[PDB]
Every structure is written in structure tokens, then in C-alpha cells.
Amino acid sequence: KDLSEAQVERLLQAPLIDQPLELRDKAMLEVLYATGLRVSELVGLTMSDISLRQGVVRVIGKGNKERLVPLGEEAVYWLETYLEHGRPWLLNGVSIDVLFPSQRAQQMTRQTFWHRIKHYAVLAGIDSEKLSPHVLRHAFATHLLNHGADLRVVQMLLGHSDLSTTQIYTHVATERLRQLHQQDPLFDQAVQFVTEKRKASISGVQRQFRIGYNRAARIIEQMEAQGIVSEQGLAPPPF
């Protein structure tokens, strides 16, 4: 509307993670998707706003009021990965507190990050000129609410109410913070992974090739078709 789930998934998958710059953008997109943060708040995050251990980001929103927004598992993974393996290459020795610095160690603006988002939207087969931040945020929201594994209860009560983007993300943050307060080209690669590791799980295929949940799922499905795996409720091991 006009964005499909499939366009959302391609967009998140488009970044090329051997490039520090795109690995940054990958983390940025995953945070945006999970948290519903505004682009202006995203590009303004500091290192001190993140807690990977707690799984939350601190955002100064309305009234300049600090609140904690749960990041989710994918954003945590890609943040970790970015911090270890991408961000140092963006500084080249320079020392700054900006979480997502530009190519040349400066804070990005909403508009320069938006230029990045347009680049990935093209690869994803999206009209990058028609696309706007509010349409993007709302497609992220809708997709999150419909596929977040921990959000099925929220999906059931509110998925059909056609809430605003902000309302979806507020309900998502509430539910996720409640829980925290309680204590295909990859097919041949995938076949060799599953026949080797012997466990066939959507989660493992997902984290093994760092792809989205639904792509991992459609890869365990192309396998049940071709005769390779046991059914949720078979092929010999290589070597």
C-alpha cells in the first residue's frame, strides 16, 4: 500500500555487508524496522543510547523525554556486527560518539540517509521517487506486526484495526518491554548446511546465511519439495 511485504524484505536484504558503509545502513534499517524511530532520531543516536545486553535503545522523543524502545533480536545482531566490523572503518581512528557516522566521520542528516534508502529501494524494485518516509515506516510497522514471532498476541487483537504507524509501534514496544521486564541462490548452500548440521530449522538457516525469516522459511519449503528434509509435524550426509 503501495508497498508489499516482499518489497520490504528485499529492501532489508539489499545492503552488501562486506562494505562498512552498507553494513552501517543494514543496522540502521533493522533499527528503523523494529523500533519505528523517526529518521531524524535514528541518524542522531549516540553510542550511549544503545544497550545490546538489555536489548533496547534510549530515544529522546516528544517533550525531550527519554524512553526505552526494545530493539528485537535482528537489530541487536546487526548492531553488534556493525559495531565490531563496520563502524571502525568509518572513523579511521577518529573518535566520536555518533552511532551511525557518515563516510567521513560526521553525523548524517535525514536527507543523506534518505538518499541511501532510495538506493536500496531501487534494488528492491520499489519506486524510489514516490517513496516517502511515512509510507516506509508504515510498511515496516505492518510487516513487523504481521511477522514478529513474539507479537502474535498483538497481531490478533490489533492487526485488523488499521492503527497508525505510531500506535502500532507503541503497542509493539509495550508488549516487548513487558517481556523484557519478565527476567533460491542459497539453496545448494542451504542443502549442504542442513545435511551437515542435521538439524533443519528456519531459525538456523536464517542465522547461518544472515537472511530474513520468511526467506529461510521458503528455503526449508523448497527442500521439503525436492525430497531433502523431514516435515515439521531425509537426505544422506556429505563427506
Residue numbers in the entry: 2 to 184, 214 to 263, 271 to 276
Paper text:
A chromosome dimer is lethal if unresolved, but most bacteria encode for an efficient site-specific recombination system to convert the chromosome dimers back to monomers, the Xer site-specific recombination system. Most bacteria encode two tyrosine family recombinases XerC and XerD which bind to the specific chromosomal site dif located in the replication terminus region, although there are notable exceptions where a single Xer protein carries out the reaction. The C-terminal domain of FtsK forms a DNA translocase motor, which also hexamerises, and was found to be essential for chromosome dimer resolution through activation of the XerD recombinase252627. FtsKγ interacts directly with XerD to stimulate its catalytic activity, leading to XerD cutting and exchanging the first pair of strands within a recombinase synapse between dif sites.
To understand how this interaction can lead to activation of recombination, a fusion protein between the C-terminal domain of XerD, which contains the catalytic residues required for DNA cleavage and strand exchange, and FtsKγ was produced (XerDC–γ) and crystallized. The asymmetric unit contained a single XerDC–γ complex, but the flexible linker joining the two protein domains was not visible in the density. The FtsKγ interaction with XerDC is a 563 Å2 interface that involves two helices on the surface of XerDC. These two helices, αE and αH, are on the opposite face from the putative DNA-binding surface of XerD and the active-site residues32. The interaction site on FtsKγ involves the ends of helices α2 and α3 and the loop that joins them3031. It is noteworthy that this is also a region involved in binding of FtsKγ to KOPS DNA, and the amino acids that contact XerD are a subset of those seen to contact DNA; not only is FtsKγ a bi-functional domain with protein-protein and protein-DNA interactions, it uses the same surface to carry out both functions. Although the structure of the fusion protein reveals an interaction surface that is consistent with the proposed role of FtsKγ interacting with and activating XerD whilst it is bound to DNA, there was no obvious structural change in XerD that would account for its activation; the active site residues were in the same, inactive, conformation as seen in the XerD structure without γ present. The E184-R1289 pair interact with each other via a salt bridge and hydrogen bonding in the crystal structure that, based on recombination efficiency, appears to be a critical factor in the interaction.
